Write a protein that binds this ligand. Structure first.
Ligand SMILES: CCCCC/C=C\C/C=C\CCCCCCCC(=O)O
Ligand SMILES: CCCCC/C=C\C/C=C\CCCCCCCC(=O)O
Ligand SMILES: CCCCCCCCCCCC
Ligand SMILES: CCCCCCCCCCCC
Ligand SMILES: CCCCCCCCCC
Ligand SMILES: CCCCCCCCCC
Ligand SMILES: CCCCCCCCCC
Ligand SMILES: CCCCCCCCCC
Ligand SMILES: CCCCCCCCCC
Ligand SMILES: CCCCCCCCCC
Ligand SMILES: CCCCCCCCCC
Ligand SMILES: CCCCCCCCCC
Ligand SMILES: CCCCCCCC
Ligand SMILES: CCCCCCCC
Ligand SMILES: CCCCCCCC
Ligand SMILES: CCCCCCCC
Ligand SMILES: CCCCCCCC
Ligand SMILES: CCCCCCCC
Ligand SMILES: CCCCCCCC
Ligand SMILES: CCCCCCCC
Ligand SMILES: CCCCCCCC
Ligand SMILES: CCCCCCCC
Ligand SMILES: [K+]
Ligand SMILES: [K+]
Ligand SMILES: [K+]
Ligand SMILES: [K+]
Lengths: 257, 257
């Protein structure tokens, strides 16, 4: 009966959390959306009136451009898709369940292979993350025992603090490189780092997609290393916080009578 | 020493898997990409020649259109963002780490709140999935014991088979709709179902945004229910397959002596 009660309580809390977040986000973003839409409408009217064009022709042209954008054509000199390096980037985003969306299959035959490839690879990546967390806990215990000098296993709180510090340090180090090389601001770099490391992957900001990129040999290697370490650390942090939340739910159930 | 060897072996296998997948995907998609690019170039040249517009003006117009698209403007009629239900959809995609990308924050203040909101919600969702898997295993054991009529826990193989069957059934039932409602093909519907249920979320196909949507009350409820069940089942399947892969790694390590 305890397990069922815990399940039901967690479901109700998640529902309330979703409702509150929806209200807050709407209140934050509605006015900016409306202003942007009005600005676009004014620009489109100005362009249509300037060159004595018609709106149906512009609609057809924009539909063709949407198709071209889906194909991969951009406005500012992007790197080619579906070469060996681009395919490596695509499979890297697929196996980690990030899914930026900058490159997607378009043919029948590529989609079946995507289904089977992902089905086989995602589980292996999850196993890799679990083994990494176990190794990190073991090395932390060994270091603590050696410094004091099995039963020296650290508590959950200290592991959480260490993971938080490591995540912050890695994010700052990665942003310090993303900021100059790209045309991004520091806060935007931190936002991109959080979105990528959590395996959410909105796709609004994607790195290493500018055709000629100076050295271009070390940059891709550094990008790969940074993304891998960030994903591992953030996943471990999520698991530890989930354990703590479960303990809190147990306390809430015990208190209520 | 065994743990370190298993870690190293898994890393090497994943690297080889990535290389092979990259080669196959490139060989599958390069020609289609090139054909699409040539088609777009021909269309753009035709339009520019026809309407006597210079290249730079068209480039500026397309840059403005990209800026407008980033805020939610489309050539077809779509539902507004950030009213109250778009926010519900956005937070639902955020907490489950799907990240379609059809709606993203654009203001300073909405990005910090996103960071903290996701940090707190993703762990709760992971805990919910784990509790669901435990409950499903327990109910399977109880049903098996009752049919035969603790020590009646099923093997991993039977759980994997049951999860596979449930995933296939849910995917087919969900694809029964989305086919006439949005005018998709059946294979495209299955592809979208797999991409969404695995929490990859490319964003090329997104459901339930066409402004007027007939009933629009039951359709959203059904969409929510279907996505929730699919995500739960596919995550459970991933965990079981990871356990099996770990057993296989142990076997091959033992064989190597
Ligand atoms: C060596 C350890 C093996 C484990 C690998 C597991 C998962 C891969 C995870 C993340 C890779 C992120 C994609 C970045 C690729 C960029 C390459 C480029 O910019 O061209
Ligand atoms: C009642 C169980 C509580 C647990 C909820 C946990 C996670 C939510 C997961 C998936 C929902 C994503 C789909 C959002 C669709 C919104 C519906 C619409 O407007 O089209
Ligand atoms: C341009 C870089 C493409 C290849 C980079 C992958 C390097 C991974 C091999 C080292 C880990 C064992
Ligand atoms: C238009 C639909 C918005 C609200 C739908 C959410 C329904 C889930 C709440 C009931 C389950 C506890
Ligand atoms: C005792 C059974 C009560 C039902 C619990 C399930 C509620 C959540 C379903 C999504
Ligand atoms: C006992 C050896 C543990 C190996 C740790 C691997 C390094 C992790 C951070 C790069
Ligand atoms: C151009 C400045 C780039 C600095 C990157 C090095 C950060 C330290 C990593 C250990
Ligand atoms: C222009 C310098 C870009 C590469 C810096 C990263 C060096 C490797 C650090 C691991
Ligand atoms: C003896 C342990 C050497 C470290 C193995 C791990 C190296 C790959 C980590 C990415
Ligand atoms: C003992 C009852 C636990 C609830 C099982 C139902 C989960 C699936 C509902 C769709
Ligand atoms: C037009 C929709 C026909 C299919 C709806 C039935 C879905 C299966 C519900 C169990
Ligand atoms: C036009 C009918 C669309 C809604 C069908 C789904 C009914 C709810 C089934 C759970
Ligand atoms: C905690 C509930 C938030 C208020 C809901 C508003 C619905 C219009
Ligand atoms: C462009 C090919 C690079 C190959 C990397 C080395 C493979 C181990
Ligand atoms: C065009 C045939 C592709 C086959 C995909 C791989 C099947 C497992
Ligand atoms: C170890 C380097 C700390 C991060 C430097 C930040 C510089 C903007
Ligand atoms: C241009 C290739 C760079 C390879 C980096 C070194 C690999 C260990
Ligand atoms: C198993 C595939 C070997 C790597 C192929 C490299 C092709 C450039
Ligand atoms: C429990 C139902 C929440 C209120 C629904 C609001 C729909 C506009
Ligand atoms: C300017 C409003 C910021 C709201 C987010 C604060 C996070 C605790
Ligand atoms: C239980 C319904 C099976 C799926 C029907 C498919 C009809 C196109
Ligand atoms: C239009 C509102 C539909 C609500 C579905 C029933 C909720 C249990
Ligand atoms: K994900
Ligand atoms: K994702
Ligand atoms: K995504
Ligand atoms: K995306």
């Amino acid at each position: 009966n305890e397990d069922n009660a815990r399940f039901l309580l967690l479901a109700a809390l998640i529902v309330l959390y979703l409702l509150g977040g929806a209200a807050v986000f709407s209140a934050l973003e509605l006015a900016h959306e409306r202003q942007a839409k009005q600005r676009w409408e004014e620009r489109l009217a100005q362009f249509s009136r300037g060159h004595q064009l018609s709106r149906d022709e512009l609609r057809g042209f924009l539909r063709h451009y949407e198709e071209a954008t889906r194909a991969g054509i951009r406005v500012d000199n992007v790197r080619p898709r579906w070469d060996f390096t681009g395919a490596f980037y695509f499979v890297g985003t697929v196996v980690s369940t990030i899914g930026f969306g900058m490159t997607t299959p378009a043919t029948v035959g590529g989609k079946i292979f995507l289904i089977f490839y992902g089905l086989v690879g995602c589980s292996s990546t999850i196993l890799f993350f679990n083994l990494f967390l176990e190794r990190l806990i073991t090395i932390i215990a060994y270091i603590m025992k050696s410094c004091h000098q099995a039963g020296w296993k650290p508590s959950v709180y200290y592991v959480m603090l260490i993971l938080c510090t490591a995540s912050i340090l890695i994010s700052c180090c990665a942003s310090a490189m993303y900021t100059p090389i790209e045309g991004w601001s520091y806060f935007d770099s931190l936002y991109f780092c959080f979105v990528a490391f959590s395996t959410i992957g909105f796709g609004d900001l994607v790195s290493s997609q500018n055709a000629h990129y100076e050295s271009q040999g070390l940059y891709r290697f550094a990008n790969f290393v940074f993304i891998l370490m960030g994903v591992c650390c953030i996943y471990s942090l999520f698991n530890v916080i989930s354990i703590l939340i479960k303990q809190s739910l147990n306390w809430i159930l015990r208190k209520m009578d």
